[PDB]
Amino acid sequence: TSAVQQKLAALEKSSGGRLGVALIDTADNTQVLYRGDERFPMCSTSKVMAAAAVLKQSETQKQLLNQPVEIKPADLVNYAPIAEKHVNGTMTLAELSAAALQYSDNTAMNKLIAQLGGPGGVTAFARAIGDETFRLDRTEPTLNTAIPGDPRDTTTPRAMAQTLRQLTLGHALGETQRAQLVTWLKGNTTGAASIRAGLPTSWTVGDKTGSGDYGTTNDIAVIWPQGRAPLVLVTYFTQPQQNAESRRDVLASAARIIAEGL
């Protein structure tokens, strides 16, 4: 198969879990996949699709991103690092999108989902841009249960890499919305130990991580080496035990395998 695939299989075996990888190299439109068509729980990587769905709405709802949204006491969930500062006040949808993407704020994610009419509104956006695989079924925090065999709140590495390419480098969004998504992803504060940790420090990265039960540890990224056409890299990882620890090192290792194979 390929040497990269052998190394990814060996990393998976050593890790004890199940690893999914999809790479798109936009320099030559080549791809590398490992368990590319298996479903994995997305956890917070689904915040990218929700933010993008609201950006898409903002293309024709010209005041949507600056609309004040009430942060009510009942909106606060377990992890609301930004929204908690705004209880009984308002945040705009742009501020909620930035908080979801850059701090993985779950209340902010739930506000995006509510704007879109529920989890099905995020899925509807996926379908509208040609992603038939993505499904969001629940809100935060229960979308992170990551139960083996449960198809809710899953996608495949292949589908997510294709969609992330369309959203950030292609034409699923209008030009200014695409640039806004890229700006937000590049400002992510939660990714240093995941894909970023496996790449040369000079490469620019925009990414979103996710974590959940069953030691689920995910990262989806767009990667710009200096002066080079970018790479899109998705790495999903999940483990057999419900209480398994996070394994961001596995994602870094997968990224290092990919980076050395460039």
TrEMBL record:
GO biological process: beta-lactam antibiotic catabolic process; response to antibiotic
Enzyme class: hydrolase
Domain Beta-lactamase class A catalytic: 20-235
Entry superkingdom: Bacteria
Organism (species): Escherichia coli
Pfam families: Beta-lactamase2 (PF13354)
Catalysed transformations (reactions): a beta-lactam + H2O = a substituted beta-amino acid
Protein name: Beta-lactamase
Keyword Secreted in record: no
PROSITE patterns per record: BETA_LACTAMASE_A (PS00146)
Record flagged with keyword Transmembrane helix: no
Assigned protein family: Belongs to the class-A beta-lactamase family.
Alphabetical UniProt keywords: Antibiotic resistance, Hydrolase, Pyrrolidone carboxylic acid, Signal
Molecular function in Gene Ontology: beta-lactamase activity
Enzyme Commission number: 3.5.2.6
